[PDB]
Amino acid sequence: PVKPNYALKFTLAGHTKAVSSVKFSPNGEWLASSSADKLIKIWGAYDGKFEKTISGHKLGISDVAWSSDSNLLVSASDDKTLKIWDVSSGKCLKTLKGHSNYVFCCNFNPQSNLIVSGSFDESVRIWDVKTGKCLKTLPAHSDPVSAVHFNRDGSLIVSSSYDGLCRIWDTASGQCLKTLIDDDNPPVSFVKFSPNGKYILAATLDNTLKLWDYSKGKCLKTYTGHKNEKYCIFANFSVTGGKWIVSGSEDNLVYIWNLQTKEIVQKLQGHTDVVISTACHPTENIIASAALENDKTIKLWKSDC
Ligand SMILES: c1ccc(-c2cn3c(n2)CCC3)cc1
Ligand code: NA
């Protein structure tokens, strides 16, 4: 319909510091969370029930991502490394070493033989999952990298940075295929492809989300009304029910927008600190949200449409 009706079903407590990142497993069974407390935690996606803790990093974790078969995780940490984890055993399979500063963002490609990472050292790196060795280092940006993401077939990587740029990279060659600039260049705090791979969603620290057609290099939609001036907040395409845009906010709310009309259709209340991360369940109308230091909780919300 024209409004979803997301309601709080579960609150997940257990991280002892700010939560940084939540992600649903591709098979829809699990939620993974990462924290400034150096831990990864696994939860049931439908019941919110705590499953296990995965540890190893020497400093806080900024991001976590699932392999396509839901069996592996990769995490990105202030200790300048990434780790690949076997979720079932908790074993750390590889430690990816190479970045010279905080690793801030990470993702598998759809085939999940590659990982891409972004760092405070202003580079983007492409790693081989099986050997744990860095395949490419891209001179991507002139300020920290805030997000990295593979498109639907893994041929392209999008990156964003505080330098105000979104860039598109050819995975196989490492060549910069495109630089997106608008009328102005505020810091870009987040970026990711649309599910079909034709568009790019980009967040800027001027309280604004933009939908880009990247092939034509034009900005199509603009989403506002939330607060985002300081933090790198995840955003999502909601595609299981109504077609929405979902994002956290520095006023402690989860914002949901009609993707077409750009109107705010729902604002979720409940967190007590900045909502830094949101995720959308692959098959059900479920949203996971997570908050910073004064809150430390993850919330699971359910809608009928
Ligand atoms: C604290 C911790 C993590 C974060 C964060 C991590 N990533 C993003 N934001 C966007 C992409 C990855 C922001 C603040
Ligand atoms: Na953001």
UniProtKB/Swiss-Prot annotation:
Changing N196A: what effect? Loss of interaction with RBBP5 and reduced ability to stimulate KMT2A methyltransferase activity in association with RBBP5 and ASH2L
The outcome of changing T179M is: Found in a patient with childhood apraxia of speech; uncertain significance
- Kindly report the protein's main subcellular placement as a broad class: nucleus
Give the recorded effect for D78N.
Answer: Strongly reduced affinity for histone H3
Q: Where in the cell is it found?
A: Nucleus
Instruction: Please tell me whether the keyword Ubl conjugation is annotated for this protein.
Output: yes
Tell me the Gene3D superfamilies matching this sequence.
YVTN repeat-like/Quinoprotein amine dehydrogenase
**SMART domains noted in UniProt:** WD40 (SM00320)
Which PROSITE patterns does the record match to this protein? WD_REPEATS_1, WD_REPEATS_2, WD_REPEATS_REGION
Q: Does the keyword Repeat apply?
A: yes
Mutation: D78A; reported impact is:
Strongly reduced affinity for histone H3. Significant decrease in interaction with KMT2A
Q: Which GO terms describe its cellular component?
A: ATAC complex; histone acetyltransferase complex; histone methyltransferase complex; mitotic spindle; MLL1 complex; MLL1/2 complex; MLL3/4 complex; NSL complex
Q: Where are the WD repeats?
A: 14-53, 56-97, 99-139, 140-179, 183-224, 227-267, 270-304
Name one process (GO BP) from the record.
Answer: gluconeogenesis
Q: How does it assemble?
A: Interacts with PAXBP1; the interaction is direct and links a WDR5-containing histone methyltransferase complex to PAX7 and PAX3. Interacts with HCFC1. Component of the ATAC complex, a complex with histone acetyltransferase activity on histones H3 and H4. Component of the SET1 complex, at least composed of the catalytic subunit (SETD1A or SETD1B), WDR5, WDR82, RBBP5, ASH2L/ASH2, CXXC1/CFP1, HCFC1 and DPY30. Core component of several methyltransferase-containing complexes including MLL1/MLL, MLL2/3 (also named ASCOM complex) and MLL4/WBP7. (Microbial infection) Interacts with herpes virus 8/HHV-8 protein LANA1; this interaction regulates the MLL1 histone methyltransferase activity on viral DNA.
Question: What is the role of this chain?
Answer: Contributes to histone modification. May position the N-terminus of histone H3 for efficient trimethylation at 'Lys-4'. As part of the MLL1/MLL complex it is involved in methylation and dimethylation at 'Lys-4' of histone H3. H3 'Lys-4' methylation represents a specific tag for epigenetic transcriptional activation. As part of the NSL complex it may be involved in acetylation of nucleosomal histone H4 on several lysine residues. May regulate osteoblasts differentiation.
Name the UniProt record assigns to this protein: WD repeat-containing protein 5
- Taxonomic source organism: Homo sapiens (Human)
